[PDB]
Scaffold this active site. Structure first.
Site, PDB file in Angstrom:
ATOM      1  N   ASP A   1       6.030  -2.055  -0.863  1.00 27.02           N
ATOM      2  CA  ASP A   1       5.351  -3.274  -0.456  1.00 27.02           C
ATOM      3  C   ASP A   1       3.981  -3.353  -1.084  1.00 27.02           C
ATOM      4  O   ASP A   1       2.980  -3.471  -0.381  1.00 27.02           O
ATOM      5  CB  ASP A   1       5.214  -3.332   1.069  1.00 27.02           C
ATOM      6  CG  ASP A   1       4.535  -4.608   1.549  1.00 27.02           C
ATOM      7  OD1 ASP A   1       4.766  -5.669   0.935  1.00 27.02           O
ATOM      8  OD2 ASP A   1       3.765  -4.549   2.532  1.00 27.02           O
TER       9      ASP A   1
ATOM     10  N   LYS B   1       0.959  -5.205  -3.000  1.00 24.36           N
ATOM     11  CA  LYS B   1       0.424  -6.585  -2.963  1.00 24.36           C
ATOM     12  C   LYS B   1      -1.093  -6.561  -2.742  1.00 24.36           C
ATOM     13  O   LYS B   1      -1.616  -5.581  -2.224  1.00 24.36           O
ATOM     14  CB  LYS B   1       1.107  -7.454  -1.890  1.00 24.36           C
ATOM     15  CG  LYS B   1       0.808  -7.083  -0.445  1.00 24.36           C
ATOM     16  CD  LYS B   1       1.501  -8.024   0.531  1.00 24.36           C
ATOM     17  CE  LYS B   1       1.634  -7.392   1.908  1.00 24.36           C
ATOM     18  NZ  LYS B   1       2.273  -8.302   2.896  1.00 24.36           N
TER      19      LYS B   1
ATOM     20  N   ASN C   1      -2.656  -5.383   0.527  1.00 24.57           N
ATOM     21  CA  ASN C   1      -2.713  -3.972   0.920  1.00 24.57           C
ATOM     22  C   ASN C   1      -3.714  -3.154   0.112  1.00 24.57           C
ATOM     23  O   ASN C   1      -3.745  -1.925   0.217  1.00 24.57           O
ATOM     24  CB  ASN C   1      -1.330  -3.318   0.808  1.00 24.57           C
ATOM     25  CG  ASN C   1      -0.339  -3.860   1.818  1.00 24.57           C
ATOM     26  OD1 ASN C   1      -0.662  -4.023   2.993  1.00 24.57           O
ATOM     27  ND2 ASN C   1       0.879  -4.148   1.365  1.00 24.57           N
TER      28      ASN C   1
ATOM     29  N   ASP D   1      -2.039  -0.410   3.936  1.00 26.45           N
ATOM     30  CA  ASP D   1      -0.891  -0.485   4.827  1.00 26.45           C
ATOM     31  C   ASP D   1       0.232   0.334   4.227  1.00 26.45           C
ATOM     32  O   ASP D   1       0.330   0.458   3.005  1.00 26.45           O
ATOM     33  CB  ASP D   1      -0.458  -1.931   5.084  1.00 26.45           C
ATOM     34  CG  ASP D   1       0.218  -2.115   6.439  1.00 26.45           C
ATOM     35  OD1 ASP D   1       1.015  -1.246   6.852  1.00 26.45           O
ATOM     36  OD2 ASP D   1      -0.056  -3.139   7.094  1.00 26.45           O
TER      37      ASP D   1
ATOM     38  N   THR E   1       6.879  -8.357   0.662  1.00 27.70           N
ATOM     39  CA  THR E   1       6.449  -9.746   0.559  1.00 27.70           C
ATOM     40  C   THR E   1       7.349 -10.407  -0.472  1.00 27.70           C
ATOM     41  O   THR E   1       7.668  -9.804  -1.497  1.00 27.70           O
ATOM     42  CB  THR E   1       4.975  -9.853   0.110  1.00 27.70           C
ATOM     43  OG1 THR E   1       4.119  -9.725   1.251  1.00 27.70           O
ATOM     44  CG2 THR E   1       4.700 -11.192  -0.566  1.00 27.70           C
TER      45      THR E   1
END
Ligand SMILES: O=C1N=CCc2cc(NC(=O)[C@@H]3CNC[C@H]3c3ccc(Cl)cc3)c(Cl)cc21
Lengths: 396, 383
Positions: free
Chosen positions: B190, B192, B195, B208, B229
């Protein structure tokens, strides 16, 4: 601020503390027990739980002092709730006495809180009058208490293998008058004195060994109990008029039992023996009357004046106030020991031990293990292990 | 395998914080029971009452020593997520200043999954990297899980993109931070700009991890559900309905793209489309022109899994021309100075974060539920 982080560590080390190292484990340990029946594993939460620990726990269970760690010698004793064993610590080859209690029975039976008072005392009493607790712990079936073996034996047995002479009586009676003032001083009334509970060590000296009654008196010497406790032949009047809810008694009652000790010891039978126990009840409440004696005065003026001073009405019993008054009573007058040394002297009987495990003073027993009861597998949470959460105690 | 033996083996387990049974874990279970039992409905059980008898008050005192959330001074809600929120705060005692994210024990049960925070905790706290946000403390109560982490005045890397000697720097750090994770045996899943956070010194870390999953000894993972995402998720993660770290790089391309460009390389008015967009990475891949090195990188990440920059050996990604430069080097990038530096007014300058404004509470049980069991052991005092 730092008024806490300090106050904390105490709690996690203090053997007297309810949440010390080994305690907190007992809780986690217990969970693992009272949840791992698949019927519950059906709960996401519960499952996710056993997952994370199960294995760890199992390993923790390998390190903690397990029953296996002990080698079983012979069934030295047995009682309603369990049994006592003579054992050698399979590792450090130490030899102790290990009493087992039945987590099962003790649930089935109404009360399962009596052992707290015992453990706390035997372990912290620190006194040659009290047997000593070294370790305590549990599985899902039993509580185990590992204690200083007493090669000596019960005094009920010594009165089945002798004819106690008054001098011997004076000595035994004095040790018991002492042993008790110990417990009294820790703010406990014993509440089940009797030969059964008086054992001897390698040196023929006495300690007390069951505390299966022990209750702590309030700030003013009293206790507010309301159910009888002890053994028919010994219990005192007060504790029979106990019958909820006027039970309200103090130290005094433990002295009455002393009288019964002293009695049975010189005589041969309890002062209220009865072919029908139910009778012993009436007898006890008629102590004034019922108190007969052998028409053959094979006894001392001092012995009598003592006994019939113990076996008198609570309102007026030797020791109603101050142990002093019992001590400086004629019967104890002598010249072979002194109150402040009695134990250093030489017991009327000494252990003729062949070895470290001479169980000759103890009448052999059958040795059935696990035979009795088995907890039922539940259909949901019951938490059977919750009231034994905290029992565990290592020390030294 | 001996009295003196195990008794050694034991102490470890009570002291080593990686252990599931450390001091602070034990307590959580003892604490948790006290919660999931104290409901009158149950105290009608002989054992259960007799039990709370013996502890209830003791525990209540233990709850006052343990790091309770009261111990902190709430500043302002610098963050917010589906399951909870991040906050800046000063330790009411030693006036220190951290970032404390809260999780909702409630929502985490109602929501199908409540296991993701373990990966997080484990990482943020044991990572010991300038590349990973650090975790100082962790703890809970009947309602929330708390994570006390090093504040990042810096901010998220998507906020920076709302205010290529710049992009090669960020992308580099992210390429490095991420290799840290992989080496720990984790595949984030994840990436992005949400984070990505920046420190007092404009340097990035990851924040995160509620997604990370440990790859087996073969660098692979056996999952079969999509996470992340939309505008980023990789192709193999959509066909998930078994893989490895390579998918974390795919995201890297997605960062580099939006970083230079302006929007994601699969943006859609209707996210729904973005699905087929990414699946047709080969085609769908549009373009507005900047660098030949930029491009050769991008369309080497946004390539099919079985053939993606870094298939094996993340050194090849390092030794790709785009990184060729002379103002920093792999083994120093962090020591240098960041393209952007925190112009902080003080220790609590929440300037880089856009100030932000149900409230479900567990149902009282008519029998034992044990809703606090899955969060037993969370608590983590670290040094
Ligand atoms: O060496 C011993 N050391 C400590 C305590 C102890 C206790 C007992 N047992 C007893 O004092 C009681 C009195 N009469 C029955 C016996 C008994 C046995 C088991 C239970 Cl569960 C309760 C009571 C025995 Cl023999 C030996 C020892």
């Amino acid at each position: 601020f730092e008024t806490r982080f300090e106050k904390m560590d105490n709690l996690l080390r203090d053997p007297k503390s309810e949440v010390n190292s080994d305690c907190l484990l007992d809780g986690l340990d217990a969970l693992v027990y009272d949840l791992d029946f698949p019927a519950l594993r059906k709960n996401k939460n519960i499952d996710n739980f056993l997952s994370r620990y199960k294995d760890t726990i199992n390993k923790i269970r390998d390190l903690r002092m397990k029953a296996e760690d002990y080698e079983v010698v012979k069934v030295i004793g047995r009682g309603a709730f369990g049994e006592v064993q003579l054992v050698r610590h399979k590792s450090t080859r130490k030899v102790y006495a290990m009493k087992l209690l039945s987590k099962f029975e003790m649930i089935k039976r109404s009360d399962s809180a009596f052992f707290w008072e015992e453990r706390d005392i035997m372990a912290f009493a620190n006194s040659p009058w009290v047997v000593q607790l070294f370790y305590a712990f549990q599985d899902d079936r039993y509580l185990y208490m590992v204690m200083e073996y007493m090669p000596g034996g019960d005094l009920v047995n010594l009165m089945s293998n002798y004819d106690v002479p008054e001098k011997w009586a004076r000595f035994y009676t004095a040790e018991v008058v002492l042993a008790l003032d110990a417990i009294h001083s820790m703010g406990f009334i014993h509440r089940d004195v009797k030969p059964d509970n008086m054992l001897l060590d390698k040196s023929g000296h006495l300690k007390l060994a069951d505390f299966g009654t022990c209750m702590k008196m309030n700030k003013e010497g009293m206790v507010r109990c309301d159910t009888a406790v002890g053994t028919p032949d010994y219990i005192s009047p007060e504790v029979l008029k106990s019958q909820g809810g006027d039970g309200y008694y103090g130290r005094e009652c433990d002295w009455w039992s002393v009288g019964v000790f002293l009695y049975e010891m010189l005589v041969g039978d309890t002062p209220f023996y009865a072919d029908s126990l139910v009778g012993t009840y009436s007898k006890i409440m008629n102590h004034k009357n019922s108190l007969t004696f052998p028409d053959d005065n094979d006894i001392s003026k001092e012995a009598k004046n003592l006994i019939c001073a113990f076996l008198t009405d609570r309102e007026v019993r030797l020791g109603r106030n101050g142990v002093e008054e019992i001590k400086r009573h004629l019967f104890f007058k002598n010249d072979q020991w002194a109150w402040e040394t009695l134990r250093d002297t030489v017991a009327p009987v000494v252990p003729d031990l062949s070895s470290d495990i001479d169980t000759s003073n103890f009448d052999d027993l059958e040795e059935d293990k696990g035979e009795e009861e088995t907890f039922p597998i539940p259909k949901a949470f019951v938490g059977n292990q919750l009231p034994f959460v905290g029992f565990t105690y290592y020390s030294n």
